[PDB]
């Protein structure tokens, strides 16, 4: 007997993968791709066409101030992106010329921070600046500003100005209470439509009564058994998860980059591990062990990677945007470049892709 608490009680009462077949990166990639885009392409396409007929209902529910939550088995990334960009935004734009901007949150990324997300939201829709009396005593300038947004948008026509799409809301860095509180407070605003998706089976455990009231979800089940190739990019599949490091996504970026950018990143990693070894394994990279931008410019000029500091900053913009390297100003006023990965991760990056 199974499928019941009694089954759990009944079941809750020396081979290794050493002798399992050996598979290379290329073999795994090609087999997975061929079994992802050719196994059941026709049934999954037919199912998607079937569930594409419920888009008017999704838009209607969003119009009445309901955040949409999509759960199921498979990759809902394509579903959410197509629904939002290809259907929701043009339809809202015509019903209200330019389309409604969509902020596509990639929650499966372990390097998703609410500071940058709120900066993007502020850029997209300009709020009133937080005044001196409203900053409080070391108050959270994000939460207070969002409450100011709520008060401002409470008395204003109920149009839609932004459509923020939350891919994999239960991801390693997007599941934390701080960003969940940010999304909860943003969900009160009726002038932004929220289309989120969840993959974890215990996802409802995240939200208490207050957060589940602010979200105001209407749960929709879209199971499609999709490969989820994009979500699995940011962590190794052969290790079987043996999550929040983010070094695997960095490596995946490193196969597809310019040779000059690869050389610059390799030099930065080498010098940062030199600094870490001078200081002291499992410790992350911070600005304490990092290169100064002037010193880095001198090194790159010595190695002909960058002619001037402007070009070096232009190259570093891509790595900073992808949350791969961070430039932060210390007490002395120096600006320091540091890669937020551990010594082992940097060594693996140098051995595998940067060799």
Site for another protein, residues 243 to 302, rule: CB under 8 A: 249, 252-253, 256-257
The Cα 200–Cα 296 span in angstroms is 42
Q: What is the CA radius of gyration of the chain?
A: 24
By CB under 8 A, the residues from 192 to 221 that bind another protein are: 199-210, 212-213, 216, 218-221
């490596």: which residue's tokens? 251
Q: Answer for the pair 224, 48: CB distance below 8 angstroms, yes or no.
A: yes
Binds another protein by CB under 8 A, chosen from 177, 307, 314, 330: 177
How many Cα atoms sit within 13 Å of 65 on the Cβ side?
Answer: 11
Nearer to another protein among residue 54 and residue 295 (C-beta): 54
| Residue 148 near another protein by CB under 8 A | no
Q: Measured at the alpha carbon of residue 333, what is the angle toward residues 331 and 338, in degrees to the nearest 5?
A: 80
DSSP state of 326: E
The angle, 0 to 180 degrees and rounded to 10, between the axes of the packed helices 259-279 and 343-352 is 150
Member of 25, 129, 131, 133 binding another protein (CB under 8 A): 133
Q: Please name the residue ranges forming H helices in the chain.
A: 5-11, 25-36, 41-51, 55-63, 77-81, 89-95, 114-124, 143-154, 177-188, 209-215, 247-255, 259-279, 293-302, 309-321, 343-352
The answer to the question of residue 304 lying near another protein (CB under 8 A) is no
Instruction: Provide the minimum distance between the beta carbon of 75 and another protein in the complex, in angstroms, as a whole number.
Output: 10
Q: For strand 192-198 and strand 67-71, is the pairing parallel, antiparallel, or unpaired?
A: parallel
Chain residues 4-43 in contact with another protein, contact rule CB under 8 A? 4-17, 19-21, 23, 26-28, 30-32, 34-35, 38-43
**CB closer to another protein out of 37 and 347:** 37
Instruction: Report the residue number, 152 or 252, with the smaller CB distance to another protein.
Output: 252
* Interface of this chain with another protein, residues 89 to 118, rule: CB under 8 A: 89-91, 93-95, 97-106, 109, 111-113, 116-117
Is the separation of the CB atoms in 194 and 64 below 8 Å? no
Nearest approach, Cβ of residue 295 and another protein (Å) = 28
Rounded CA-CA distance 102/23 in Å is 40
Told to check if 330 binds another protein by CB under 8 A, we report no
Residues 40-79 that bind another protein (CB under 8 A): 40-44, 46-47, 50-51, 53-54, 56-57, 59-61, 63-64, 66, 71-74, 77
**Which positions from 225 to 244 touch another protein by CB under 8 A, shown as an x/- string?**
x-xx-xxxxx--xx-xxx--
Q: Interface with another protein includes 158 (CB under 8 A)?
A: no
């Amino acid at each position: 007997f199974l499928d019941t608490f009694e089954g759990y009680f009944d079941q809750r009462k020396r081979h290794t993968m050493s002798m399992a077949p050996d598979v290379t990166r290329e073999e795994f990639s090609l087999v997975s791709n061929f079994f992802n885009e050719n196994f059941q392409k026709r049934p999954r396409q037919k199912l998607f066409e079937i569930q594409k007929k419920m888009f008017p209902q999704y838009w209607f529910e969003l119009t009445q101030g309901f955040s949409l939550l999509f759960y199921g088995v498979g990759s809902k990334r394509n579903f959410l992106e197509e629904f939002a960009i290809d259907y929701l935004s043009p339809k809202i734009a015509y019903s209200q010329v330019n389309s409604i901007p969509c902020l596509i949150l990639n929650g499966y990324n372990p390097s998703c921070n609410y500071r940058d997300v709120f900066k993007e939201i502020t850029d997209l829709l300009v709020p009133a600046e937080l005044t001196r009396s409203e900053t409080k005593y070391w108050g959270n300038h994000v939460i207070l500003q969002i409450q100011k947004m709520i008060d401002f948008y409470k008395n204003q026509p109920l149009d839609i100005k932004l459509i923020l799409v939350v891919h994999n809301l239960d991801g390693p860095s997007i599941r934390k209470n701080t960003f969940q509180t940010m999304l909860s407070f943003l969900s009160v605003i009726r002038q932004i439509a929220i289309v989120a998706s969840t993959d974890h089976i215990y996802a409802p455990l995240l939200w208490d009564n207050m957060k589940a009231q602010n979200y105001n979800f209407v749960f929709h089940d879209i199971s499609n058994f999709e490969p989820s190739t994009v979500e699995s990019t940011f962590q190794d599949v052969m290790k079987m998860g043996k999550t929040s490091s983010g070094a695997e996504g960095a490596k995946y970026v490193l196969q597809s980059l310019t040779v000059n950018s690869k050389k610059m990143y390799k030099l930065l990693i080498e010098t940062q591990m030199q600094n870490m070894g001078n200081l002291s394994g499992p410790k992350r990279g911070t600005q304490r062990t990092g290169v100064e931008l002037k010193l880095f410019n001198h090194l790159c000029a010595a190695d002909f990677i960058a002619s001037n500091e402007i070009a070096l900053r232009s190259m570093l913009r891509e790595f900073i945007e992808h949350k791969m390297a961070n430039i932060t100003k210390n007490n002395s006023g120096m600006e320091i470049i540091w890669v937020p990965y551990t010594y082992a991760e940097l060594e693996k990056l140098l051995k595998t892709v940067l060799n």
